[PDB]
Point group: D6
Chain length 135, copies 12
Amino acid sequence: DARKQEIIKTTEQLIEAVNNGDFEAYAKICDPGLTSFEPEALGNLVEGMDFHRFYFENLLAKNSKPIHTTILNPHVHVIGEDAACIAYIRLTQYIDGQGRPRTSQSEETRVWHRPDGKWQNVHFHCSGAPVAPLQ
Amino acid sequence: DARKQEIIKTTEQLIEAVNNGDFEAYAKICDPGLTSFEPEALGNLVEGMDFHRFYFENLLAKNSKPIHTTILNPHVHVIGEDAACIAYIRLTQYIDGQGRPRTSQSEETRVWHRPDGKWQNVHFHCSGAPVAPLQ
Amino acid sequence: DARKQEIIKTTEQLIEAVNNGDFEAYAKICDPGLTSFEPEALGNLVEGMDFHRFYFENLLAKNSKPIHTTILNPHVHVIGEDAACIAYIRLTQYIDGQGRPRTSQSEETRVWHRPDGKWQNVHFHCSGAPVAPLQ
Amino acid sequence: DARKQEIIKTTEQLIEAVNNGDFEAYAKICDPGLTSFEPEALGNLVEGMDFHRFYFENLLAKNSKPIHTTILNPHVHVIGEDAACIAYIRLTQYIDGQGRPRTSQSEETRVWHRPDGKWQNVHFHCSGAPVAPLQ
Amino acid sequence: DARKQEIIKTTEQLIEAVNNGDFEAYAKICDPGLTSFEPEALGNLVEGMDFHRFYFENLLAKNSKPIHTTILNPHVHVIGEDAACIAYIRLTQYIDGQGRPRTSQSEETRVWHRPDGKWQNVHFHCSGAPVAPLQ
Amino acid sequence: DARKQEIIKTTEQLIEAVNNGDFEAYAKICDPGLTSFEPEALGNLVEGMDFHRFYFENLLAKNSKPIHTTILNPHVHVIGEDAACIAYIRLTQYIDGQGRPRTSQSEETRVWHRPDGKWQNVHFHCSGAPVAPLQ
Amino acid sequence: DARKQEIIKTTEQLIEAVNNGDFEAYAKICDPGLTSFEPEALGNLVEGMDFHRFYFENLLAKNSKPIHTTILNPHVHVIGEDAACIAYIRLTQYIDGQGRPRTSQSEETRVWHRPDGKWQNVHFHCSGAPVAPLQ
Amino acid sequence: DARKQEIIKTTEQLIEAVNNGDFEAYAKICDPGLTSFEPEALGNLVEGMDFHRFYFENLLAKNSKPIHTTILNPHVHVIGEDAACIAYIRLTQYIDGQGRPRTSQSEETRVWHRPDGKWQNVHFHCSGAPVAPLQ
Amino acid sequence: DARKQEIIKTTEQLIEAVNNGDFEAYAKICDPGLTSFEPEALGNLVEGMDFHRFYFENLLAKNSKPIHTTILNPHVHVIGEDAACIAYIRLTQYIDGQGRPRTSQSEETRVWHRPDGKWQNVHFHCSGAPVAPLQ
Amino acid sequence: DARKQEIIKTTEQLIEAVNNGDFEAYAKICDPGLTSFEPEALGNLVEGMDFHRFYFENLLAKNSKPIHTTILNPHVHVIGEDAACIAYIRLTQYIDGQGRPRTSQSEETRVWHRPDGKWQNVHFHCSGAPVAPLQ
Amino acid sequence: DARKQEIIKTTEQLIEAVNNGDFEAYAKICDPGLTSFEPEALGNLVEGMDFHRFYFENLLAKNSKPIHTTILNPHVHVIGEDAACIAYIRLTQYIDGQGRPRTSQSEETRVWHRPDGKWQNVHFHCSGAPVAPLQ
Amino acid sequence: DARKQEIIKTTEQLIEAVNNGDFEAYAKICDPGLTSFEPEALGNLVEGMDFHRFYFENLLAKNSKPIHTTILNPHVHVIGEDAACIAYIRLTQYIDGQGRPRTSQSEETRVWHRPDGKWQNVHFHCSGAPVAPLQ
């Protein structure tokens, strides 16, 4: 359970670096060849950092309204000593463009490798609501 | 490229065992603790074989109409010697309940481990069209 | 955990007596003053057995098609020695009126009392899909 | 009828502490392990206080417009001396974001335990309109 | 409570004479100048028996499928010794044109007079679902 | 026709006391145990004055725009000397939230008793448009 | 009232000649230069018999199912000794293409002249449901 | 053709008195017992001046924007020397609530009598767009 | 008026040759370079006979059900001695694919030239319903 | 081709006089008995100048925003020496009520005569988008 | 114009080989590395013959109903002596799944190369209606 | 691969000249007889520069908000030494009319010729989202 709690802790560091808009910390968690599927990419497989960079510069660095996030039913597969995978449900509570509280759901998969003693993310898949909020 | 072609070959064996309705071969490719996200599970994370078993018994063992499948733009991450991940776009051509040809798209992620010298699947995530066909 | 497994076992006996259409076993699990909220009652609070009796006589005793049910994330509150409450997510896999497999979800609460040494159900609440199937 | 009037009185204290935005009184009525089903949680079972805390901080502490609430057809099950359950219909009259009066309906179940001589809430289930108002 | 139970009993005789298709008994319960509002009359006030006669001749005398009816929360006003009024919610369980069980709701008011020692109906108002079933 | 004109006159006094917002005159026309069905109550049977009080305090005491009302095809049943019933179509002409004239229709039933020499209202049923105007 | 009852009687002869499919009697009631507005003419003013002839030949001579018609609130203007006008609401009860009873409403104006001692129809206007039934 | 041109001229005087908002001239053209069918009356037959008075006071006396009206294909029936009927298509060109030109269509019937040497209107029927404009 | 009646007569010969399915007579009325706009051509300008030929071969030669056509408000421009233009509204009464009478409207323009002593059609424009019927 | 270029040139003079709002030049191109079909006339045949005059006075004399027009695939029929007909597709590029560029399509027919040595327009037919722009 | 007529002729040979279902002639016109965009491929770029092969085997070899095709406004770019490009509008007239004639439109681009003395197709792009017909 | 990288480089120069609003550089890349299919042209084939000029003058020269563009899966056909064709998927990230980031997809084909030693564009085809952004 010690190695599973380590993957959980490192995944929580990713999620709070994203919602802080901290792109310089996000870039240290991600591999340069990272690939992803997500609702914003319209069914295409994205590669590298530059597609995601646009949302840090146009939302996450600029926003100020309160947000709360719940992680439900996490499951971890540990795949030897170099590799791991985590899957969870995410609920986000947020304030819309006219002051009403709202909720949305996503389903997320993250794939982790340990090159050079540090855990880094190599592939990501998301379903459900967009991460760009529906305000 | 040799190890990447091996993951491609093993992923093609999974896809043809599914569309043949060969549940006894499917059960040798999958780990007993396998987890999944897919459109049929309504946003929930499924564990084990028994949710999928229902579709082999009520479609895949019984169907006879022609189907064709195209795999587009595959990408493989090889994660040491025990682990790998593959991501691809899938297009399926099928005949509906009244003889008309149709097309649908999915986006798929599969996570592979090599316990006891044999590659086996430990997590799967699907977006887009259901695998239960829209006939 | 022994008393929690007992409530789980007794709740599984209720669910299989319903999907067998066994109204004479259902009547031994329920209290005569049982109350319920469910989608079929259109927002009203029902009392007694006679509202439910209609669905045993017009579906559950007559149906023959295959059904599978998954219970997800159960939680039990044990409230002294006489009382308990259980909450769970239910997924049902079923065949429609033209041979296609389908899925639906409900959320369920059940309240249990132990009069005369036997566990019996006194209140029930359901949300999501109707239990009368969407075939 | 004396013990039933006591559960009614305590349920009315909960409802007025919520619509006053009095989170410090709400926290004394609820057990720390409380679970719930409600429309805002999107079909998931919530545990603990922190999901509900967001609506006290972003609505109930800040609102000033007039509200009226009617409780219809309450039913109480008393389950020995430590335990009780209550079920009722709730109608709420409220003013929208442009000054028009509106109405909405919910159906609610609440499960009560008496640890250490004080009644506290251990499970809650809601159907119908959200508690976050449709202004 | 004796006179209220008499109005309840006489109202149950009306409802079962209607669902039996017994127009010759219905004609003995109704005053010749009876007026009504109901969904089938498109917002108009009907007078006399001949508008209702059409539904006995084209449904109620001819139907054979099982029907169940629940009366909820009845209230009676007794207005001296010659007059009374009753108000109730009606739920009807029925089988559709393809064998599926269904539910519908109406709200009903009935006004009763005692000319010549016999109770007879002088005005009726219905809201909600039509009495002609939605099969 | 003299007693019928008296019920008509008293019903017109009710309608103008409501559209003046005169809740202290409305309370002298109504019995303390009065019951009603209306579109604002969402299919439920309301009892007493406090549900209606909210619309006097949040509209009828505060409004200033011109309104005109037409009563069509009234019918009266006189039920001995203590009791009467009246039924009519109501058309209301009103100005919306942006200065355009509009029309709406309701169908209404009212039940009258004469305790202590004064006519008072004991039950009411409404269908069609809400009495809260669609501005 | 004698001359008004004569216009009513002659208008009832027209309506029953139409629903019998008796085009040879209809042609004796109508002036050769008769004009009309009705839903079937798509906003145009029709002149003469030949537009209406098509509905006698393709429905009214061929139909066999039961129909009932109610005339509501008739008003007559008598305009000297040669001329009259009548206006009424019409409700029609009919059976659809699969055996269910249905209702529809129209509003109708008819203009009458007495050339050569016989009343004949010179202009007609209809609003609401089409006369061609919605089976 | 002289008597037909007289009815045309008098009908044009009505139409321009209405669009000027000249209710004191309108009241001299209409009979005190005039009846009408029109889209604003929701399927009911109106009698007298007071329903129409509301639109003079809340639009026609207050408006200032340009309007143009075309009368198409008029037909006149002259019914002895005391009575006449006219039927026509009306097209209205108008400016909406945000400055765009718009068009709408009605179909109209008007019935005229000559009491005391002066032509006056006794019945009116309208179909298509409301006369209260769709701005 | 003699030359206008000649264009009317020749236009009626075209319309009855079309609804008879008489393509060999249609080909004698049309110029070889004829152009047209119509709903079936999806906004394109068609040239020559071969686009129209398909509807003679697949409907007009094969149909048997009764059809009636009304021509409304025709207008003719005569343009010297060689040339003419006609414009009219067309109403068609027809029986649908399940035996119900239906109506549809078109607006039509036709341009006529007299080469070699015989009138022939050189351009046609249609708006409204398709001539291929909505059965 | 010289006479065809003359009709093209004169048709371009009409189109630019319209979009300049130059009603005094438009009136010299049109014959006083001109007829038209267009979307703004709701399926009716218009005659003379006064229907079109309203759009010069309420838009074309007042507008200032940039517009561009493309004429596609023109075809000309020359019908002796006094008469001609032209048909074309028209695309219009325009700025909406909030500054965004938009496109729309019409199909147009125009009929030309040469009385007194000057070409003038006698009939016009339009389909597709209205000439009043959809800003 | 000789080389342009050659590209037109070769493009007509492709279109008739497709609608004959002649896959062995289609394979001689296409380059082995051919790429395409079309509505059936859901926004993806297809490569090679095997995606198209499915529609020959499941429609074009099996169909028997009459089809007609019009090519509108073709444009050819000739790019030295080895290469050419053609663009056209295509209208297809066809019979649906219940015997009614229908029309649909596509816009098509085709790119041609002359390796080894024979013209062959290297890229294709289609917009508008699918080539799999909407029967 | 050198000649393919040259076509890629020249295609990237076109795309950045367009999103800079640099119409004087765009005019040096395009042939004077260039043809195109695109969503803005409503299914028509455009020729020359003047249709596109309108979007430079009314958007691209005036806009200031941030935009990002991704080119996916490019494919090049090189057709001797004078000619080439390129096909790709384009994703655009942009800010809407109220500050929210958005995504859209197009599929694009471009045909290139080398007259006088300089590459120039002769035909273009686009599917999917309009190039005028959906803000």
